Design a protein around this motif. Structure first.
Motif, PDB file in Angstrom:
ATOM      1  N   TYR A1017       0.824  -1.200   0.000  1.00 26.67           N
ATOM      2  CA  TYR A1017       0.000   0.000   0.000  1.00 26.67           C
ATOM      3  C   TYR A1017       0.862   1.256   0.000  1.00 26.67           C
ATOM      4  O   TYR A1017       1.797   1.375   0.794  1.00 26.67           O
ATOM      5  CB  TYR A1017      -0.933  -0.009   1.214  1.00 26.67           C
ATOM      6  CG  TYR A1017      -1.786   1.230   1.407  1.00 26.67           C
ATOM      7  CD1 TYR A1017      -3.011   1.365   0.771  1.00 26.67           C
ATOM      8  CD2 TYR A1017      -1.387   2.241   2.273  1.00 26.67           C
ATOM      9  CE1 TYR A1017      -3.801   2.485   0.960  1.00 26.67           C
ATOM     10  CE2 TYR A1017      -2.173   3.364   2.471  1.00 26.67           C
ATOM     11  CZ  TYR A1017      -3.378   3.482   1.811  1.00 26.67           C
ATOM     12  OH  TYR A1017      -4.160   4.598   2.005  1.00 26.67           O
ATOM     13  N   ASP A1023      -3.184   4.178  -2.953  1.00 26.36           N
ATOM     14  CA  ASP A1023      -3.489   3.021  -3.783  1.00 26.36           C
ATOM     15  C   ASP A1023      -2.361   2.000  -3.689  1.00 26.36           C
ATOM     16  O   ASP A1023      -1.284   2.268  -3.150  1.00 26.36           O
ATOM     17  CB  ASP A1023      -3.728   3.408  -5.253  1.00 26.36           C
ATOM     18  CG  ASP A1023      -2.773   4.483  -5.749  1.00 26.36           C
ATOM     19  OD1 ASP A1023      -1.595   4.483  -5.338  1.00 26.36           O
ATOM     20  OD2 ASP A1023      -3.202   5.324  -6.568  1.00 26.36           O
ATOM     21  N   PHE A1024      -2.622   0.817  -4.232  1.00 24.45           N
ATOM     22  CA  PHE A1024      -1.728  -0.325  -4.121  1.00 24.45           C
ATOM     23  C   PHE A1024      -0.907  -0.515  -5.390  1.00 24.45           C
ATOM     24  O   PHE A1024      -1.360  -0.222  -6.500  1.00 24.45           O
ATOM     25  CB  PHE A1024      -2.528  -1.593  -3.811  1.00 24.45           C
ATOM     26  CG  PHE A1024      -3.175  -1.568  -2.457  1.00 24.45           C
ATOM     27  CD1 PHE A1024      -4.347  -0.858  -2.243  1.00 24.45           C
ATOM     28  CD2 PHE A1024      -2.607  -2.248  -1.392  1.00 24.45           C
ATOM     29  CE1 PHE A1024      -4.938  -0.824  -0.992  1.00 24.45           C
ATOM     30  CE2 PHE A1024      -3.197  -2.226  -0.140  1.00 24.45           C
ATOM     31  CZ  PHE A1024      -4.364  -1.509   0.062  1.00 24.45           C
ATOM     32  N   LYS A1048      -6.783   3.798  -6.227  1.00 23.64           N
ATOM     33  CA  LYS A1048      -7.658   4.290  -5.174  1.00 23.64           C
ATOM     34  C   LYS A1048      -8.987   4.711  -5.784  1.00 23.64           C
ATOM     35  O   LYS A1048      -9.017   5.440  -6.780  1.00 23.64           O
ATOM     36  CB  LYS A1048      -6.992   5.477  -4.471  1.00 23.64           C
ATOM     37  CG  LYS A1048      -7.735   6.059  -3.275  1.00 23.64           C
ATOM     38  CD  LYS A1048      -6.926   7.202  -2.662  1.00 23.64           C
ATOM     39  CE  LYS A1048      -7.748   8.050  -1.705  1.00 23.64           C
ATOM     40  NZ  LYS A1048      -6.993   9.266  -1.292  1.00 23.64           N
ATOM     41  N   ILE A1077      -9.394  -3.756   0.617  1.00 18.79           N
ATOM     42  CA  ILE A1077      -9.560  -2.922   1.807  1.00 18.79           C
ATOM     43  C   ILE A1077     -10.468  -3.558   2.868  1.00 18.79           C
ATOM     44  O   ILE A1077     -10.540  -3.062   3.990  1.00 18.79           O
ATOM     45  CB  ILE A1077     -10.065  -1.533   1.346  1.00 18.79           C
ATOM     46  CG1 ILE A1077      -9.200  -0.982   0.200  1.00 18.79           C
ATOM     47  CG2 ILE A1077     -10.055  -0.501   2.485  1.00 18.79           C
ATOM     48  CD1 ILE A1077      -9.831   0.166  -0.573  1.00 18.79           C
ATOM     49  N   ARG A1088      -0.846  -1.114   6.078  1.00 22.88           N
ATOM     50  CA  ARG A1088      -0.749   0.344   6.044  1.00 22.88           C
ATOM     51  C   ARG A1088       0.659   0.861   6.309  1.00 22.88           C
ATOM     52  O   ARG A1088       0.871   2.078   6.291  1.00 22.88           O
ATOM     53  CB  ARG A1088      -1.726   0.976   7.041  1.00 22.88           C
ATOM     54  CG  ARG A1088      -3.181   0.932   6.600  1.00 22.88           C
ATOM     55  CD  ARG A1088      -4.111   1.432   7.694  1.00 22.88           C
ATOM     56  NE  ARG A1088      -5.509   1.159   7.378  1.00 22.88           N
ATOM     57  CZ  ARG A1088      -6.147   0.042   7.712  1.00 22.88           C
ATOM     58  NH1 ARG A1088      -5.517  -0.909   8.388  1.00 22.88           N
ATOM     59  NH2 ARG A1088      -7.420  -0.120   7.376  1.00 22.88           N
TER      60      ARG A1088
END
Length: 1201
Positions: A1017, A1023-1024, A1048, A1077, A1088
């Motif tokens: 993340y 966003d990933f 995202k 998520i 996170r």
RNA sequence: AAUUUCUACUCUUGUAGAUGAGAAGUCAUUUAAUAAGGC
DNA sequence: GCCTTATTAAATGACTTCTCGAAACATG
DNA sequence: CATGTTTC
């Protein structure tokens, strides 16, 4: 530019002929029309007869032939195991050999059968192509009721009608490779399918020998080919036996099977037995599934009606037939009035003992869908009750035996009743009472009148529908006497079923007559009682052809003078018409030898004599010929010496130039000395010795033989001739010629006036042709009016670019050495998108987009919605037995305008157009008409002599010879492969490298996630990021490494301010991110901190969580996201370019594609830049062959990264 | 709502574009009915 | 409910071959 | 011879 006059095009103009004065009345008095249409009718009557002649002869020949096809089999195998120009040519030439062998059998020079029968066949053929057929002497040899011969000399003394027909029949027997020839059909069509069939057989056997025996007795059961082993019917000599249609039939039946009267069990053919075997779903079926399963049936033999061992119903003649016989049938069925006893049987079965009522296993699923929720529900309600009744421990094996026990056995009624409960019972009772009531209804309501109109047809369809529905209901119950049934019930139940089968036959016959096309009157051929009418136009035999022209002040006129005199010219501008004067010398290749060397007298004297012979007839200066010339055109050898084929075989050009040199010298001798052409001034022609190949010489000779002169006659004279009846005058007329029309005319009218314009008559870029015909069509702000009166139609052909070569000589290489010379020109390209049927694109040479458009709607009319409604209405019509109707006219009016502005801003941008080569009827039609419009381009406003005008056209496309032989590049149009234009983010130049069929089970999903380096993340952006090296997951990939080695969910807004969610994916539309998520909070994984998530999920090894992760990577990697209801078709990119932008077509930036289809067209055209940039990159050559996906894919990126 | 014919139109008894015809043959596809199966 | 393979009928659609000829010849 | 037919 300057692309013009490259190769000739031939087109056909249509007009209306309006009789003048007594002319029309004259026809009435002469009744020409009745005899003309009468002869047409007789022609349609006579054709199938004469075709029985041709057929019977071809049959005898093809029966006689036995060849060794092994050489051909090798020529094919040697074609591709590995294929090059060498193997291709070699195979074309052996194809030639086999063809020519069959044709040898036809004409009787084959080595094989004896020379006596050879002579017989040759005599027969020579008789077979001309009026000899009608004498009946040709029929005498072959193994003719009083009606046919009456038709035969109905056309006697007129046979030249069938002149056209003759050519078609030659097209059947020709040895050339042409789709319409029998030798072609046998060699190139049927035999390869046969050979492949032998392959399928052999592979299947070496895998599964049991199948061999099955095949044998399948053949035993169909009764075909009893004398021959199954292994032999797949040997090639049997394909010797396969040449006749009757045999082709029998073969295709052993593949297909035999089906007799409906409702009876069908006989299985090989393809069927194979399919059933596959659906048995065991190890064997798996194997067969891996192999080719389906034998290919052979194509029909040319000219001959198909035959069948299956059942075909008696046709229904007309209204009174169908309605009278049906009505008799139903009144008979009410006379038996046991439609009442069907209800009596259903009350009876709800009364009687229920276990003796049995249901066919085949019908059970239909039962479950009709009376119940779904098919599944009844069948597996039975399943779990049968399971509940199993003893002791339960093995899955046992439950399997349960399943197949349901599929193989009929069910008592309380088994299904008790399994699914009594909700099924009064479901039954309810459907029962319904299907009976409907039936009774249709039995009472009478039958109409005639069937002329649709609603009249509708009651018929409905009545048959509910009768047939009762038949199905009755068809539910178990037939076999093996089953236990209360004897009364089963007895008279099979009774009423036997009562109901003629309703099946009536249904199908009725459908077949009802859905037939409705009658229409159309044009028929007017020849006005002369067979040569409007053959050709010029002076001497106008008297024979009876057709001449006239012009007055811009009015056009077709004169027609049926035979039993001459016309006197005067000075201009004295009260009269200017009549065209035509003098023409058809192509001297055919002709000069006919009028000089090939005369019967020349030949006859030359076999006897050496000494040359002068001939004085139709020659101003007597013209002599010598053995050298005469044998020069008749070598008694296959090739002519001066043509190039001789040059290849003989390899000595010296003698060959000598030959064509003196032959040309002879042509000029003849011409200077021939009555017609001695006057023609030939000074333009180059020295005779110079010309490289003869064909060019002939093409430059031929135009100077066509002269259009003109002379005014006086209109009192032929006003008198018209009112006499000696001459029939029509005005050549159309809409643009009427009056009070001045807007711009139609293109054909410009062709016409420009054809006869003084500048073209000076020297010609367009020419009038023979072969024109006359037509009469009877009748059917008022529309269709043109069809509600009896009208005359005139069909005349013309040719454009007469001076120009017959076929384009080397058109495409130079056609863009023009693109070699200016890379500046942009690129049009086209995609046929499913969302919107046509989508265009125009890209700059630098690669920046100019315009993006859709053609769903043009001229303030949506053609997509009109079409959509039209085909919906179509299928509605076909299931309702409504007349279907034609969409072709609509389709090509639409595509007419599309073509218009496509070529228009093709011109204004002076660009190259690029199309996609492979729903799809609309596309293929589109580039057909585009190629056609670019073979000849005319602009209405331009002056004639200026390029683009009626005299000087543009030609941007190589001549269309056919579609199959089209190379990727034709003229300025460039064909390109479709794939990956559609599916690729433009910025990324990236895709899913892999097929998802290889990620299937849990182990492969684990491996797939272990191919990715990290997934973590991003805290800043939100966003990933998933990093993947293209060198990993090689077992999953599609083998396209490309170039690079390695969202995202927000609310964004387009240029217009419309919200959309970033990263949203789509039947079903959902976001993959918000579960991850959730999924990561469901597993408690800490993402996170920027931590790599993949090893935590793989070490945890949750099956469901890993499958869900792989599904998320699935949905991200899908760029095209479309739902028709939402009208969403968009491109959203899973990866970020080096500028930090994830492309989304929902941002509506015009610099980039607006929707998936727009991106589609855009890379399609850009690939053209890639192609012509490759041959910009390599000096000279000729356009590239194909684009590989790997070469294309890499490209974008370097350009784009 | 006018046509060589098609499509779209109507300030205009007409308007804009398109239009290779005829003959012959072949193949493909849709729909329905039927047969044996698969789910 | 959908699908596979096959047969029958009706339908539309699309492709592929040729001709686009005046003058020699023959038949009566 | 004239014209439908067949030609190259």
């Amino acid at each position: 530019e300057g692309f013009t006059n490259l190769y000739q095009v031939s087109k056909t103009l249509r007009f209306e002929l309006i009789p003048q004065g007594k002319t029309l009345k004259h026809i009435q008095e002469q009744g020409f029309i009745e005899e003309d249409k009468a002869r047409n009718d007789h022609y349609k009557e006579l054709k199938p007869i004469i075709d029985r002649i041709y057929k019977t002869y071809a049959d005898q020949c093809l029966q006689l032939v036995q060849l060794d096809w092994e050489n051909l089999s090798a020529a094919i195998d040697s074609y591709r195991k590995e294929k090059t120009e060498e193997t291709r040519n070699a195979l074309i030439e052996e194809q030639a050999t086999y063809r020519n062998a069959i044709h040898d059998y036809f004409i009787g020079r084959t080595d094989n059968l004896t020379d006596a029968i050879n002579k017989r066949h040759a005599e027969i053929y020579k008789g077979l192509f001309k009026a000899e057929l009608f004498n009946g002497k040709v029929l005498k040899q072959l193994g003719t009721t009083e009606h046919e011969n009456a038709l035969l000399r109905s056309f006697d003394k007129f046979t030249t009608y069938f002149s056209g027909f003759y050519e078609n029949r030659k097209n059947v027997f020709s040895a050339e490779d042409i789709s319409t020839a029998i030798p072609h059909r046998i060699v190139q069509d049927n035999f390869p399918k046969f050979k492949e069939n032998c392959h399928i057989f052999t592979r299947l056997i070496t895998a599964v020998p049991s199948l061999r025996e099955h095949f044998e007795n399948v053949k035993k059961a169909i009764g075909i080919f009893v004398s021959t082993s199954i292994e032999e019917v797949f040997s090639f000599p049997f394909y010797n036996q396969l040449l006749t249609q009757t045999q082709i039939d029998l073969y295709n039946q052993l593949l297909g099977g035999i089906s007799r009267e409906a409702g009876t069990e069908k006989i299985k053919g090989l393809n069927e037995v194979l399919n059933l075997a596959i659906q048995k779903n065991d190890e064997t079926a798996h194997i067969i599934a891996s192999l080719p399963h389906r034998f290919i049936p052979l194509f029909k033999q040319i000219l001959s009606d198909r035959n069948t061992l299956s059942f075909i119903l008696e046709e229904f003649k007309s209204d009174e037939e169908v309605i009278q016989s049906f009505c008799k049938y139903k009144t008979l069925l009410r006379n038996e009035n046991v439609l009442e006893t069907a209800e009596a049987l259903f009350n009876e079965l709800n009364s009687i003992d229920l276990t003796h009522i049995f249901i066919s296993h085949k019908k059970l699923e239909t039962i479950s869908s009709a009376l119940c929720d779904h098919w599944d529900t009844l069948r597996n309600a039975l399943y779990e009750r049968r399971i509940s009744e199993l003893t002791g421990k339960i093995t899955k094996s046992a439950k399997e035996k349960v399943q197949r026990s349901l599929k193989h056995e009929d069910i008592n009624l309380q088994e299904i009743i008790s399994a699914a409960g009594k909700e099924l019972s009064e479901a039954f009772k309810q459907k029962t009472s319904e299907i009976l009531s409907h039936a009774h209804a249709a039995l009472d309501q009478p039958l109409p009148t005639t069937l002329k109109k649709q609603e009249e047809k509708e009651i018929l369809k409905s009545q048959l529908d509910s009768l047939l529905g009762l038949y199905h209901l009755l068809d539910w119950f178990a037939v076999d006497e093996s089953n236990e049934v209360d004897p009364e019930f089963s007895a008279r139940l099979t009774g009423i079923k036997l009562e109901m089968e003629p309703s099946l036959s009536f249904y199908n016959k009725a459908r077949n007559y009802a859905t037939k096309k409705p009658y229409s009157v159309e044009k028929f051929k007017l020849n006005f009682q002369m067979p040569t009418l409007a053959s050709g136009w010029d002076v001497n035999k106008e008297k024979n052809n009876g057709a001449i022209l006239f012009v007055k002040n811009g009015l056009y006129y077709l004169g027609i003078m049926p035979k039993q005199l001459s016309f006197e010219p005067t000075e201009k501008t004295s009260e009269g018409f200017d009549k065209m004067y035509y003098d023409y010398f058809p192509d001297a290749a055919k002709m000069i030898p006919k009028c000089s060397t090939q005369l019967k007298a020349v030949t006859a004297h030359f076999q006897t004599h050496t000494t040359p012979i002068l001939l004085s007839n139709n020659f101003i200066e007597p013209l002599e010929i010598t053995k050298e010339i005469y044998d020069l055109n008749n070598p008694e050898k296959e090739p002519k010496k001066f043509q190039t084929a001789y040059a290849k075989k003989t390899g000595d050009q010296k003698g060959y130039r000598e030959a064509l040199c003196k032959w040309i010298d002879f042509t000029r001798d003849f011409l200077s000395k021939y009555t017609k052409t001695t006057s023609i001034d030939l000074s333009s022609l180059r020295p005779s010795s110079q010309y490289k190949d003869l064909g060019e010489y002939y093409a430059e000779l031929n135009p100077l033989l066509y002269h259009i002169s003109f002379q005014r006659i006086a209109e009192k004279e032929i006003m008198d001739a018209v009112e006499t009846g000696k001459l029939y005058l029509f005005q050549i007329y159309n809409k643009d010629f009427a009056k009070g029309h001045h807007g711009k005319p139609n293109l054909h009218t410009l062709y016409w006036t420009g054809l006869f314009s003084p500048e073209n008559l000076a020297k010609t870029s367009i020419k009038l042709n023979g072969q024109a015909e006359l037509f009469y069509r009877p009748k059917s702000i008022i529309k269709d009016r043109r069809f509600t009166s009896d009208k005359f139609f005139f069909h005349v052909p013309i040719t454009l670019n007469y001076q120009a070569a017959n076929s384009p000589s080397k058109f495409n290489q130079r056609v863009n050495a023009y693109l070699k010379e200016h890379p500046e020109t942009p690129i049009i390209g086209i995609d046929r998108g499913e969302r919107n049927l046509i989508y265009i694109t125009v890209i700059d040479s630098t690669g920046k987009i100019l315009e993006q458009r859709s053609l769903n709607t043009i001229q303030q009319f949506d053609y997509q919605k009109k079409l959509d409604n039209r085909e919906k209405e179509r299928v509605a019509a076909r299931q309702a037995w409504s007349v279907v109707g034609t969409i072709k006219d609509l389709k090509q009016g639409y595509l007419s305008q599309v073509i218009h502005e496509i070529v228009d801003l093709m011109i204004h941008y002076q660009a190259v157009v690029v199309l996609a080569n492979l729903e799809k009827a609309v596309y293929q039609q589109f580039e057909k008409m585009l190629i056609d419009k670019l073979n000849c381009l005319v602009l209405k406003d331009y002056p004639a002599e200026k390029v683009g005008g009626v005299l000087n056209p543009y030609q941007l496309t190589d001549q269309f010879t056919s579609f199959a032989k089209m190379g990727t590049q034709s003229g300025f149009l460039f064909y390109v492969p479709a794939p990956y234009t559609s599916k690729i983010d433009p910025l990324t130049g990236f895709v899913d490298p892999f097929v998802w069929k290889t990620i299937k089970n849990h182990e492969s999903r684990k491996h797939f996630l272990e191919g990715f380096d990290f997934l973590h993340y991003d805290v800043k952006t939100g966003d990933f990021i998933l990093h993947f090296k293209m060198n990993r997951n090689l077992s999953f990939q599609r083998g396209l490494p490309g170039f690079m080695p390695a969202e995202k969910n927000e609310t964004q807004f387009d240029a217009k301010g419309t919200p959309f969610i970033a990263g949203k994916r789509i039947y079903r539309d959902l976001y993959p991110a918000n579960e991850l998520i959730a999924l990561l909070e469901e597993k408690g994984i800490v993402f996170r901190d920027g931590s790599n998530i993949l090893p935590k999920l793989l070490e945890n090894d949750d099956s469901h969580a890993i499958d869900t992760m792989v599904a998320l990577i699935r949905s991200v990697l899908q760029m095209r996201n479309s739902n028709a209801a939402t009208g969403e078709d968009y491109i959203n990119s899973p990866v970020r370019d080096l500028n930090g932008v994830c492309f989304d077509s929902r941002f509506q930036n015009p610099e980039w594609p607006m929707d998936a289809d727009a991106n589609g067209a855009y890379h399609i055209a850009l690939k053209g830049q890639l192609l012509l940039n490759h041959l910009k990159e390599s000096k000279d050559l000729k356009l590239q062959n194909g684009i590989s996906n790997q070469d294309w894919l890499a490209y974008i990126q370097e350009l784009r990264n």
